[PDB]
Structures are given as structure tokens and as C-alpha cells.
Amino acid sequence: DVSFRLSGADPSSYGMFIKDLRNALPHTEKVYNIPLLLPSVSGAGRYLLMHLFNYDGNTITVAVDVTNVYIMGYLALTTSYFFNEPAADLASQYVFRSARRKITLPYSGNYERLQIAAGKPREKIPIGLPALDTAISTLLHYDSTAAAGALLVLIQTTAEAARFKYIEQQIQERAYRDEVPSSATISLENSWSGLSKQIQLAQGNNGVFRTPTVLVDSKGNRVQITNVTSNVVTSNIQLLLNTKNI
Numbered sequence: 746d747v748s749f750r751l752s753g754a755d756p757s758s759y760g761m762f763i764k765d766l767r768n769a770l771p772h773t774e775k776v777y778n779i780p781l782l783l784p785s786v787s788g789a790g791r792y793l794l795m796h797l798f799n800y801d802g803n804t805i806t807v808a809v810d811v812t813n814v815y816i817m818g819y820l821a822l823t824t825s826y827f828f829n830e831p832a833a834d835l836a837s838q839y840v841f842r843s844a845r846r847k848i849t850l851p852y853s854g855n856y857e858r859l860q861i862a863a864g865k866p867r868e869k870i871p872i873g874l875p876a877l878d879t880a881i882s883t884l885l886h887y888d889s890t891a892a893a894g895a896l897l898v899l900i901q902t903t904a905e906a907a908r909f910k911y912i913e914q915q916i917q918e919r920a921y922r923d924e925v926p927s928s929a930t931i932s933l934e935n936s937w938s939g940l941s942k943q944i945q946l947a948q949g950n951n952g953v954f955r956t957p958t959v960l961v962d963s964k965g966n967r968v969q970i971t972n973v974t975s976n977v978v979t980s981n982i983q984l985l986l987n988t989k990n991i
């Protein structure tokens with residue numbers, strides 16, 4: 746399991762948590778020195794438990810699929826909550842089995858469905874460590890509209906930061922003040938699968954991408970990523986989605 750405590754959190758301790766989250770995910774190989782997540786994992790071992798505590802020290806446990814860093818659901822006190830999707834249904838066979846009841850959220854976990862539920866695109870939802878405190882607090886007691894927003898914050902501050910050092914850094918800058926995510930953040934989030942695939946295909950193409958990946962950079966400019974010498978690959982991305990799962 747991994748844990749994170751908002752009380753006393755600072756950029757350094759958040760960065761530590763994110764490192765621990767990345768290190769909790771298994772891989773047998775690296776591709777251009779980036780850990781390649783497994784194609785598949787059998788049974789219960791497929792799910793990592795991330796214990797999160799708000800500033801007041803109340804906690805939720807979040808279940809994360811170690812093959813794709815997707816959040817399946819979470820436990821708040823004696824009640825479990827899972828997305829309305831086959832993968833999370835499965836997860837519910839293995840995790841939080843002693844919850845007194847299980848709620849299926851009225852939406853799947855994809856960004857587009859969460860945004861609709863939350864009533865706003867994530868461009869307009871501030872993120873940061875205080876937003877994460879708020880999100881944990883929201884999730885402690887069921888409210889599906891509010892939870893959609895809290896889940897968007899939760900996903901981006903945990904899984905997306907684990908995937909991209911740049912997003913980790915964004916959150917670090919938002920340690921004590923939330924701000925909407927930069928376009929670059931959105932762009933990386935949206936491109937993780939595509940980036941992951943091209944990086945894997947580049948191996949056999951001398952580090953060159955079969956299809957270039959268009960992103961938004963730190964300056965708010967469009968950039969075209971063609972090969973593994975880009976900073977996106979050498980410095981930013983930290984985990985690759987197996988092409989088996991694309």
C-alpha cells in the first residue's frame with residue numbers, strides 16, 4: 746500500500762508520495778529507461794491501495810489498477826464506491842470486501858463522463874493539494890455530483906502526477922494554492938496512451954515515433970513529439986501503458 750497525509754504536507758513530502766506510488770507499480774522491463782507496466786495481473790494483486798488522509802486526518806482508501814493506474818473505486822468508512830464500468834465491477838470482487846455496502850457511482854471513470862456529471866470540464870476545475878484535501882473530504886460522504894468533481898481532482902493529483910513528472914511539479918506549485926491545470930497538463934493527460942504506444946513502437950524504429958504525438962508545452966505552445974530524445978520522453982513521462990492494453 747502507499748499513503749499520503751495532507752496534514753503537514755509540503756512539496757517535498759508530496760513528491761515523496763508520488764515516487765512511492767510509482768515504485769508500488771510492478772514492471773519487468775523498462776523501455777528507454779521508463780518502467781513498462783505489465784500487460785496483465787492475476788486477481789487481487791492487480792490492485793494497489795492508496796491511503797489518503799485529509800488535513801483533519803480522516804481517510805479514504807483508493808484502489809488503483811497497477812497495470813494502467815486507473816482508479817477503480819474507494820472506501821470511505823464502511824462504504825465502498827466503484828465506477829460504473831466492467832473493470833471496477835471486477836475490482837469489487839477483490840477489494841474492500843468487508844465494506845458494509847457497495848455503491849456504484851452513476852458514471853464510469855472516464856474523463857468525459859466525469860466532466861458531464863461534475864457539470865464542468867476539468868480546464869475549469871482548480872487542482873492542487875488543497876483541492877485534494879477538499880476532494881477527500883467530499884468523498885467521505887456520498888454526493889454523486891460533488892464526487893465527480895472530487896474524482897477529477899483525485900485522479901489528476903495522484904495517477905496523472907505518477908505518470909508525468911511535469912504534472913507532479915504542477916501539483917507541487919499548487920501545494921498551498923489551487924489553480925486550474927495548464928493546457929500542457931491536459932494535453933499530457935490526454936496523450937498518455939498515445940505517448941506510451943509510440944515510445945514502445947520506437948523500439949524497433951531507432952527511437953523514432955511511427956506517428957508523431959502533438960502536445961502543448963509548458964509555454965502554452967503546440968509542439969510535435971517525433972522521437973525519444975524529446976524531454977517528454979527523457980525527463981517527463983514516468984510510466985508506460987503496455988501496448989497490450991491499447
Ligand SMILES: *[C@@H]1O[C@H](CO)[C@@H](O)[C@H](O)[C@H]1NC(C)=O
Nearest residue numbers: 953970971972973974975976
Ligand atoms: C527528434 O527530436 C528532437 C527533439 O525534438 C528534434 O530536434 C529532432 O529533429 C528529432 N530527430 C529526429 C531524427 O526526428
Ligand SMILES: O=C1O[C@H]([C@@H](O)CO)C(O)=C1O
Nearest residue numbers: 814815816854855856857900
Ligand atoms: O480512460 C480513462 O481512464 C481514466 C479513469 O479510468 C479513471 O482513473 C480516465 O480518467 C480516463 O479518461
